[PDB]
């Protein structure tokens, strides 16, 4: 029981770094790559967990 609690209650802090695509776009990059990564990267950042649905079933 204690393991599951510590497992679920483990805190995650790693200083999620910010990406400056403009910097990489300027210094050097493959044409269409820096932009393709940005648009695809941003798309997944929008997705997030649905805490509401889980809150109800439990």
């Amino acid at each position: 029981l204690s393991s599951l609690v510590s497992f679920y209650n483990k805190q995650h802090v790693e200083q999620i770094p910010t990406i400056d695509f403009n910097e990489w776009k300027s210094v050097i990059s493959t044409q269409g790559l820096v932009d393709k990564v940005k648009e695809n990267y941003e798309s997944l950042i929008k997705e997030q967990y649905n805490t509401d649905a889980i809150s109800k079933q439990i």
């Binding site: 997030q48 967990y49 805490t51 509401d52």
Partner: peptide, 29 residues
């Protein structure tokens, strides 16, 4: 920015759980 989303979602689960207090009213009825 993810921390801002974390805190917002965090409070959501709290309010959703406290709603269980409404279920207690069902028993009284």
């Amino acid at each position: 920015q993810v921390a801002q989303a974390n805190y917002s979602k965090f409070r959501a689960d709290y309010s959703a759980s406290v709603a269980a207090f409404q279920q207690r009213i069902k028993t009284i009825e």
